[PDB]
């Protein structure tokens, strides 16, 4: 049988085994094709995927972050153009924007799953502090008042930090700013995706509101020294009253109960992100699938991609990974009425905004990770007291950098 090689980022608790279980129905019905997944850690994924494209030494297939798809597809001769080979009618239409290069009709990836970041909260902490999550998290300033009530209260054998978020360089630095900028009434780029615009008055108001939560003590300043993975573990250990995180954490916290007796999962809830003056907006992310032009099994690889778009494969990978499907028929399944999953679905469906699918965005995120993290260094007073004016200068500088890339 053809052994399709496939790179995946760590999308679930046991990524390789989980992937293999989801594709077992495919090999059952296609005995000539097996799948060998290889895990590629997120911090190395852009360099490794890019090196695979430029060198010609590549697997048959790789997962690609939705925001990077245009960058890899724009590399001449790197990927197989999928335009016309995939029935787009089956997909949630909003998920297709990242499969194309913006400004063209060229599709170089197939949507695989979507995700957004929602507001997890500890029910016991909110009940003690008199915080009512559905309404007290509904707006910027109601959220802020809620953090004031939650900060420092004693739950279990610890003093809880009201909000815990990472500040260290990783791909989520910009993602965690995104919906504060959108909700303030700003954006990262103009409609054409050719000019950076997040130094606008409204964009800065969202950057100022969010970053100054830590200056005011409502967001845990020491936690800014950590990355997303460390924040997710800390919240799983009960360190924070609230945190903005993706749905995948539900897998880890559920296993923590099954394996360690940590019942955190049973005393947490999730609400949509608070609404800003622009209305509610949320980060829309996810990953697509691509076929390398160097593959010697392009026919078999396309069959596997089509399987991953099937209703049952979309549901089963959602159940194990907690990512949201991109195929409309998958939402006929009652699984997405789950109390936690339904929140992510409603939020990304109604309010999810994705970045412009331009070839330069991958290089833009490299700069964002380094540039916007300097705002957190300003908050942490690494070099001098905090000042908003220094944040404005960082944002102006980062914007200039992005403008050179575009
Ligand atoms: O910006 C590049 C892409 O990022 C995607 O978000 C991913 C984050 O970059 C990544 O840090 C995070 O990693 C999770 C992992 O999914 C999970 O299995 C593990 O348990 O915890 C990690 C965090 O500590 O995963 C997300 C989602 O894959 C965007 O979705 C994508 O649009 C974007 O191109």
Numbering used by the authors: 49 to 454
From the paper:
Clostridium thermocellum has extensive potential in lignocellulose biorefineries as an environmentally prominent, thermophilic, cellulolytic bacterium. Previously, five putative sugar transporters, denoted A to D and L and belonging to the ABC transport systems group, were identified in the genome of C. thermocellum, and the solute-binding lipoproteins (SBP) of these ABC transporters were shown to bind different dextrins by isothermal titration calorimetry (ITC) assays. To gain insight into the structural mechanism of the transporter specificities, 11 crystal structures, both alone and in complex with appropriate saccharides, were solved for all 5 putative sugar-binding proteins, thus providing detailed specific interactions between the proteins and the corresponding saccharides. Combined genetic, biophysical, and structural studies have provided solid evidence that transporter A and transporter B are the major glucose and cellodextrin transporters, respectively, among the five potential sugar transporters in C. thermocellum.
To identify the carbohydrate ligand-binding mechanism of the different Cbps, we successfully solved the crystal structures of unliganded CbpA, CbpB, CbpC, and CbpD, as well as the complex structures of CbpA with glucose and CbpB with cellobiose, cellotriose, cellotetraose, and cellopentaose. The unliganded CbpB structure and the complex structures of CbpB with cellodextrins (G2 to G5) were determined to 1.70 to 2.00 Å resolution. A hinge motion was observed between the unliganded CbpB and its complexed structures, and the rigid body rotation angle was ~17°. The complex structures of CbpB with G2 to G5 could be superimposed well, with a root mean square deviation (RMSD) of 0.15 to 0.51 Å. CbpB exhibited a long substrate-binding pocket between the two domains, and the glucose residues at subsites +1 to +3 showed unambiguous electron densities, indicating tight ligand fixations at these subsites. A large number of residues at subsites +1 to +4 are involved in the extensive hydrogen-bond network formed with the cellodextrin hydroxyl groups in CbpB. Furthermore, W90 and W296 lay parallel with the glucose residues at subsites +2 and +3, respectively, and formed aromatic stacking interactions with the ligand. CbpB showed high affinities for all of the tested cellodextrins (G2 to G5), with the highest affinity for cellotetraose (KD = 0.562 μM). The structures of the CbpB-cellodextrin complex revealed that the longer cellodextrins had more interactions with protein until DP 4, which is consistent with its highest binding affinity with cellotetraose.
